[PDB]
Design a protein around this ligand. Structure first.
Ligand SMILES: Nc1[nH]c(=O)nc2c1ncn2[C@H]1C[C@H](O)[C@@H](COP(=O)(O)OP(=O)(O)OP(=O)(O)O)O1
Ligand code: NA
Ligand code: NA
Length: 156
């Protein structure tokens, strides 16, 4: 059985648009993602998701709501990524471009799936339907899924 490391992912989802962040630099440049990072010692997962959103994008929120949980496994990496997925419609402030990340809104008929993580094509449609989900994806590298499971759940 592998060990897992906790991560967060926040989708800034409004009725007609979603805010995503593009990686500007390095391995994975050009890919659009929600906002998040590693959970730190002593914080709740939800508080870590809020902190990461603020650190990564400049945005604050009053509340998040949990919408999913996805485990990622990469070939060659013994540690699983346990990603806790949150969404909010209610944001404070404007998103900020950093040296690492450029934020941009996309209309919900222009979701840039080809330039997102491949798994997003599977679970983001559930998020748009206000469904909750559990997922697992095994990757060879950044582009290829070798195995995956996705299931709608009533409780995350
Ligand atoms: N397959 C995938 N699909 C997806 O939609 N988001 C993914 C993903 N794989 C990783 N992510 C997201 C999860 C999380 O928000 C982020 C990865 O977190 P990072 O390792 O960048 O965290 P930190 O910035 O805390 O790490 P440090 O490098 O240690 O500072 O990318
Ligand atoms: Na971090
Ligand atoms: Na990061």
């Amino acid at each position: 059985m592998k060990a897992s490391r906790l991560y967060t992912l926040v989708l800034v989802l409004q009725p007609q648009r979603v805010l995503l962040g593009m990686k500007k630099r390095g391995f994975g440049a050009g890919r659009w993602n929600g906002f998040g990072g590693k959970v730190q010692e002593g914080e709740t997962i939800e508080d870590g998701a809020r902190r990461e959103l603020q650190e990564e994008s400049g945005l604050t929120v009053d509340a998040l709501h949990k919408v999913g949980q996805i485990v990622f496994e990469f070939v060659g990496e013994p540690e699983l990524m346990d990603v806790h997925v949150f969404a909010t419609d209610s944001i404070q402030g404007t998103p900020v471009e950093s040296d690492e990340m450029r934020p941009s809104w996309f209309q919900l008929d222009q979701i840039p799936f080809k330039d997102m993580w491949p798994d997003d094509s599977y679970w983001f449609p559930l998020l748009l339907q206000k469904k909750k989900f559990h997922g697992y994806f095994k990757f060879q590298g950044q582009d290829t899924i070798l195995d995956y499971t996705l299931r709608e759940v009533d409780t995350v």
